[PDB]
C-alpha cells in the first residue's frame, strides 16, 4: 500500500510524462529493447528495426509506446484500485503474448531510467521510491492475475 503522499509524487511525475507521451514511449521501448534484447523478440513487427534511429522513425513503434503508457497511466491514476484495468492486461500478457514478470521488471527499470533522464528535478529519491513502489504493486497484482489464468511466468 502506498501513502497518499507517495501517490501524489507518482501522479506528479506522470503529468510530466503526459506532456509528450509519444516521446516517452519511444525512449522507454528503445531502452527496454537495447538493455534486454530478448524482449524485442516478442514483437514481430519491431525486431527487424536495427538502429535507434530506425526505432524512432517507426510510427508503429511510436503508436505502440502510446498504447503502453496510456494503459499504465490509467492504472497508476487508480492508486491501487486497479483490478478492472489490470485484468484485461493480465489476460493478454499471460495467455497471448506470454510476458514473464521478469520482463515487467525490465520495462519498469526502463521507465524509471527515462523518467529520471527527462525529469531529474521532479524525480528525485522520494519520487523514484514512490514510482518504484507503484510499479512493484502493479507487478505483484498482475502476477496474481497471471496465476489465476494458469500462467506461472
Ligand atoms: C508497464 C507494463 C506494460 C503495459 C502497461 C503494457 C500494455 C500493453 C497494451 C495496452 C497492449 C495492447 C493491448 C494488449 O494486447 O494487451 C500490448 C501489446 C503487446 N505487448 Fe505489452 N505492456 C506492458 C509490458 C510489456 C512487455 C514487457 C512486453 C515484452 C517485450 C510486451 C509485449 C507485448 C506484445 C508482444 C503485444 C502485442 C501487440 C501486437 O501484436 O502488435 N508488453 N501491451
UniProtKB/Swiss-Prot annotation:
Nitrite binds at residue 64. Pfam families: Globin. Belongs to the globin family. The keyword Phosphoprotein applies. This is Myoglobin. The modification Phosphothreonine is found at residue 67. Its EC number is 1.7.-.-, 1.11.1.-. Residues 1-147 form the Globin domain. O2 binds at residue 64. Keywords: Cytoplasm, Heme, Iron, Metal-binding, Muscle protein, Oxidoreductase, Oxygen transport, Phosphoprotein, Transport. Heme b binds at residue 93. GO terms for cellular component: extracellular exosome; sarcoplasm. InterPro entries: Globin, Globin-like_sf, Myoglobin. It is an enzyme of class 1 (oxidoreductase).
